Amino acid sequence: HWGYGKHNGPEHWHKDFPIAKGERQSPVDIDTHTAKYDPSLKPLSVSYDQATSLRILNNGHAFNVEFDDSQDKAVLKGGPLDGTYRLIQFHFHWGSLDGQGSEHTVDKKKYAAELHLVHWNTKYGDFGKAVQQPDGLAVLGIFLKVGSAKPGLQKVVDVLDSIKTKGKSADFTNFDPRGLLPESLDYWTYPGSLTTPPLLECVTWIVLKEPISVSSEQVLKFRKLNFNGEGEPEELMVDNWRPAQPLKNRQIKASFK
Ligand SMILES: [Zn+2]
Incomplete structure (x- = not known):
């Protein structure tokens, strides 16, 4: 299947997902x-007060903290x-090292x-229909550097032991994603794609300029996760990033000026 190793990583994705070489x-x-x-951009509005986290899942490529998206509880608006x-x-x-990963x-x-x-455009009704649209998704990207610990990250780090291997999940209610944001909402934006298969060209990227700081100890716990399933040979979940692609x-x- 696809992954990040020598034999199925980003250089191979195009053979099953030919949009990998797209525009x-x-x-x-x-x-x-x-x-x-662009002075025409309107302010970004991040409204997460009523977010309802539900679960955390190791999907074999990363871990996802999932939300209830059946109502406008946590939304992104404005900006582009x-x-x-x-x-x-x-x-x-x-x-695998602090010098790489983004x-x-x-x-x-x-x-x-x-x-x-990851956010989907409510005009399309659900995620699956949104990824059939050129404006179906908005992904807010935030860089992490190693330095002081991020207090709002620690509840995530501490549950990772319960979802070490592919296919494990755990309850993860009452988590506030506002604790992962930097002070400033200054951003860069461009039209792009999912960064993993199926690499669909549906995403308005909004990348914050200000990184958050996390501690060495926090990112080390990310690196103890596993790509493999329980009972299989251990392959640490590290270097699960796609390199930069042509801007075209x-x-x-x-x-911001
Ligand atoms: Zn991603």
């Missing part, structure tokens, strides 16, 4: 000097977006990890 693939390098400030996008899950990509890069800089908060005919916009 609006993600991630990309964000060249900060070439991004254009038309309409309302509802939070359905978040997950991370991370490295999917997007900033002037070729790789961060230790990258958080993706795209412009990255900045919300």
